[PDB]
Amino acid sequence: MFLYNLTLQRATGISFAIHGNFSGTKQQEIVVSRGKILELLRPDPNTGKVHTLLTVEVFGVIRSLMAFRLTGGTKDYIVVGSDSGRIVILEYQPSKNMFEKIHQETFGKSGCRRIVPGQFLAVDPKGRAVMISAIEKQKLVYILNRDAAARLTISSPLEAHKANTLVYHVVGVDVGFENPMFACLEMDYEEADNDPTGEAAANTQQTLTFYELDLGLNHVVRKYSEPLEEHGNFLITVPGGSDGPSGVLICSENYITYKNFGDQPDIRCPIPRRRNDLDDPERGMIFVCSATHKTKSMFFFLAQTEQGDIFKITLETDEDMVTEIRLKYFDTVPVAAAMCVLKTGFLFVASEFGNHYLYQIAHLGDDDEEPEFSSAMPLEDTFFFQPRPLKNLVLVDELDSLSPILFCQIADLANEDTPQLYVACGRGPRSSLRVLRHGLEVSEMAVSELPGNPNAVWTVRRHIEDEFDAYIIVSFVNATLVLSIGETVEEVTDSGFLGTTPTLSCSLLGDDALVQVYPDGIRHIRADKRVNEWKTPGKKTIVKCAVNQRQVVIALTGGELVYFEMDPSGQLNEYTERKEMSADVVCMSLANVPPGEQRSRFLAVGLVDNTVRIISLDPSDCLQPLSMQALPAQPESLCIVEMFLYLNIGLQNGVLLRTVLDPVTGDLSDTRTGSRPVKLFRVRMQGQEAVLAMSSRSWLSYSYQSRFHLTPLSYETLEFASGFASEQCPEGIVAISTNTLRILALEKLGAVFNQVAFPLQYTPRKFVIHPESNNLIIIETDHNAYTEATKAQRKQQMAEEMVEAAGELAAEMAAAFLNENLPESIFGAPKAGNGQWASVIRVMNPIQGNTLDLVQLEQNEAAFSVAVCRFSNTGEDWYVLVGVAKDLILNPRSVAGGFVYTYKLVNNGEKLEFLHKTPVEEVPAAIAPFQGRVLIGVGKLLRVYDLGKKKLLRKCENKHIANYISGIQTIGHRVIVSDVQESFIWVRYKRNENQLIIFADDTYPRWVTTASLLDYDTVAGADKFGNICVVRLPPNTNDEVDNGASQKAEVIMNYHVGETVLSLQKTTLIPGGSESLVYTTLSGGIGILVPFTSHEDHDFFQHVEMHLRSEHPPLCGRDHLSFRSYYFPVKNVIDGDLCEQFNSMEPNKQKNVSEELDRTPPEVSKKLEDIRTRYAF
């Protein structure tokens, strides 16, 4: 079983985000750091949207991302700290749309070790040196200096290790071109490890040590060091030198203390909290992230707290020292992992969970009534900051991507044939039920019904220099309608077309002249009021036409071709010859003229005899055949386009065949576009020439980084389409529907999979699909939370305690506190507690966004498993059994008891009625039907329970589990239970004696998170360490039986995906293709594993991967085999993402790899695209 892993949707969760002039121009870029891929974003200052400029997979876990620039430079570098033992300096090359590695020096071994540097990386603000240190006992500082040819060069690194010392966070000090210092939070654990009494473990606070790097001595030494009052989580580098005083702000729990080095006194300020907070008072408050905005006049800081309270941090200072720290709450934001303050009022909010946000710095945060707690302001009591809406920034854009690794069910719940990916993703109040469909979002800007039966649509501008269209032509069956698009589009008659007849084509020939194509003749309309007519010769009529930028080809009846040439004086000149064809013309195509050239060379003409022929339009070989190509069906439409150009041709059936643009016909490709005639329409998508198909599904083909990408439209089918450009619609497409006109536009680039999210209340765990009701039953449970009735009781207790102060008693803040309900999705969820939880069961229809029913659990109730099936003792009534736990949290708090509630699923799965709630001694984490009964796994006890009138009667029990049953997949004959730290084992259930016997086990333990049965003896399971494994039972294993087990199961496939997988499903993503092992990720990524059908193709893919591992190394300095062999060694796994870089790599290296593979680079591209077309959308 040789498989081939492929990525369908990249990871959208960002772990780090930097801002600066990475492109070397005045525009600032946003370098985002995903899980296993690097991303370069460029926000539009006019449009307010963030576009992905580049996206490259680093094939490794990047743990640090920082930017730096030398003195007097104009471009910011990119320092990337990954899990490898090498430091990589990257320099994005715009003149190539790729990140060029400047330097790469190895420092240690691979892996996320404690003694391996790469976890922390600080850069100097002057760009003189960079410091990379590990979590403990390792620290290195390399010097960066420019060469004579302005090239960045690195020197030998300086070792600065310290034994038995742990580093929390490091940051470089802002020095005015002096000796650079690197401040970091240190903690000596030597005394705590040599004291069994535990006295040395207590009273051991963190010590802020500032290590200075002597440039004259070429060595670093710990110059300054001072202990702190409390433990710190992160630091904030204050700019010094000419702009502000030097120093750093140390963030801590409920306190902030900026303590500069030297004679500067320590000034501390407590963290302000929200007024009348519903959270627990015993829990502290720390900062989550911090942003710095530096200007020539002054500088400010923006740090978000644990509740997402973004406060505007300001520091009053004297001539040489700091006076006080004045903080003020700017607005309210979600929990963001990184914040980037850009120029011209732009704030990028990269959320740690859920969709991201990009608030633009609107207000300065000052000049308001908001109370700004100063550092000098004494308090013995913390400035209770009020939760005021962010009235200083405006979300310019949102990157709501993936970061869940929760649950996903890929099924065709809708009426369409293509299955949708119903994936519940989110965290707490930001959770949502997103149904992902592979398509494209169409934004209908205008829609108006059209009389009669329209057959075509056209849009021609007034001038060649005009940036927008001016005339819109609608061709009916017996006439033609022309409209003028000036933001008030109505019926127009003075255009000069005189549409009393249906029109075949309408475009602009000259710079300001128009050309209309009719079967009764040709009509030329210049800039002035002049009509140049050209009637058809004889009684024949024009069947088809082909217009261009400087060419006009027309086809009459009987295969009579007529060529018209555009004179440089502005007139049209007909050809001196008429070429005849062997059959009638059914399709004609004319490519656009180049800006350098004056005319097009190739002209495609489709015949009725199922054959395509190319005709040269040069004056040397005009009306001469160039290349012929047979077609399996009658052609319907043809269109040639650039990106290196290819000519597409659509047939009358649901299939189309394309060919390259050359003097001879080269490679060919085809796909089932169908039960509809495939028409070809040219469009402008993202500033590039794209093709728009007209069939039962409207697919838009567009190339993306030397790789084609064609997704269908998520709308109704259309008959004709044309590109549109106006002031209201800058980039749109006018599509003609059945007796209706619709002006749509494709704003979002949803080529991967478009999603529609239905929001939930808490973090979901698993979802169940009802067979008869066709609905979704998802349970949303989250720890450290309270229920709705518990929150209402806490609010009532707070309102009772607020009136207990007896303040003149006469002040009623309860009417403003209890009535005002703050949104948990926007202003954060006020939830706390150690053992408290909040579970909620809700049944919602997948077609709509509303929920049919909702069931709230108890206060200390937390559901972990859910199943919906029927009982053998009962009739056809589907029962929904959901197991919950009582008093649970983490490993320190041992689980108390458990319960299993039963639902009736009344009104054909529209309402749930609680029948019984059977308790349990252990927490149930497994519920699955098995031969009319329900298998209940509570802890390490696997019990088979039956349906009872009072409680679930357990008919069987099995205590052979190692630690705890985490998952259970039941085959028709056997049962496969998945342990927590042990690998899954196969167990046979005897129906005669009601005794479950384990007949197979595994030899290697793995922290399994999800699994799926591939066959009767082969099972594939995920790993918590970011790997994927597939175990197959041996054929000599005896299921009838009575270190741990005798029969062992061999692992036939193992591959480290690098992301936490929690959902696996083997199904067909597209009808007609092959089924693949589609897997989800916790970082918002979707992947698919496809098995190899041919041994020669598998060997070719293995040779291509072996060539690519030597020709294109990863940018993170790690090895591909070492990344694939992180947890388990690779066995029959081919990474298609590394093979996809052959089109993005160098052309000479691609030609060398193709010569080593004895093929062509387009042949290798076609062989790579064939597996994707066979296995994916």
Binding site: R672, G1072, S1094, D1170, R1174
Partner: peptide
């Protein structure tokens, strides 16, 4: 490779047909 390639083309056929459905 070539013989397989002949087969490969057929393989493509199935997927294309699937798309049509």
């Amino acid at each position: 490779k070539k013989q397989d390639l002949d087969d490969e083309e057929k393989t493509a056929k199935f997927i294309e047909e699937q798309v049509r459905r």
